[PDB]
Amino acid sequence: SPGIWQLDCTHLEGKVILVAVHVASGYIEAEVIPAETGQETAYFLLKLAGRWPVKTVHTDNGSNFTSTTVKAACWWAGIKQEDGIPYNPQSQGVIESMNKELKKIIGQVRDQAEHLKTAVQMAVFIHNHKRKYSAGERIVDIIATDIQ
Amino acid sequence: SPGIWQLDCTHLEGKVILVAVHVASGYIEAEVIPAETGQETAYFLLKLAGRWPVKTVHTDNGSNFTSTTVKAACWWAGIKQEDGIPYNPQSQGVIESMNKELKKIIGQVRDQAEHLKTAVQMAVFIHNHKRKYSAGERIVDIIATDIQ
Ligand SMILES: NCCCCC(=O)N[C@H]1Cc2ccccc2[C@H]1Cc1ccc2c(c1C(=O)O)OCO2
Ligand SMILES: NCCCCC(=O)N[C@H]1Cc2ccccc2[C@H]1Cc1ccc2c(c1C(=O)O)OCO2
What we know:
Chains A, B: Residues 1-143 form the Integrase catalytic domain. Chains A, B: It comes from Human immunodeficiency virus type 1 (HIV-1). The structure is a homodimer. By secondary structure, chain A is an alpha/beta fold. Chain A has six helices and five strands. The first copy, chain A, has a five-stranded mixed β-sheet, with helices on both faces. In chain A, a hairpin with a 2-residue loop joins strand 1 and strand 2 (15-22). One ligand E4F sits between chains A (39, 42-43, 46, 69, 72-73, 76) and B (112-115, 117-118).
């Protein structure tokens, strides 16, 4: 569980926001892309796995699960690719809630940024720093504990 | 010192690789950009600060130090912007060594990627996972200790 992430794709302003959530902490990384292709997803996962110890990824849909490019990236980065089928429905809803929460934050900052990508990164910042401990704190504590 | 990062800009294939190094661990994040502008640097810092607790940034040159856009991003993200003047001279060399080491790794993977950006993210991955403990391990341990 320190190494488990979930992909999530949501839409805003005719664009796609691709999100990776560290399941145990709620910590996220996100990017804006024109559309969700295997290529974009593969590149995003490579970035993520270089930055955090990504062991398992629950893919967001069957197209990405099937994608040979995504499979190649997962092989390259040592990621076990899994389906994102919510066998525990606290996952349809927990994801929905995150997308709504992120879009809320994006709207709160949207006027401060010319470009959506900037607003999205502002939202990532606010989300990961928000004391509820913060998600940023939780992920670091979880991984440090695992390491030792 | 858990919050201190250093910017570093290096060149390859007519492109620019912008690197942020967490000084205490050697952990890096990096991106390829067409050229090093205040706008690109500001966006890069926003991304970084959303993902790790960036307190202080030693900027890579005076243009970025001066940039009103970089200053705005640093204000937004709660980053103290500092000059990157190596008052402890082992620093120009430690950066030079990192750039040479990253370019070496990039050359070792370059053939596996159509695009330089992919090779750069492969290099980030290899760099942060390399046992020497790894840089990824060191940054997490340093921050977890600080938090607690
Ligand atoms: N509408 C207000 C105009 C902003 C003037 C100004 O300096 N803003 C800061 C605020 C702020 C706050 C955090 C980070 C960057 C920025 C800058 C914006 C910016 C910079 C770089 C970018 C951007 C944009 C963007 O504006 O999206 O896009 C991709 O690279
Ligand atoms: N056999 C038919 C095609 C094989 C190609 C193939 O799947 N390579 C993997 C290897 C590999 C290893 C790690 C991550 C991605 C990739 C993929 C490459 C790739 C994917 C997405 C991208 C890229 C590139 C790129 O090539 O730079 O650029 C920006 O977004």
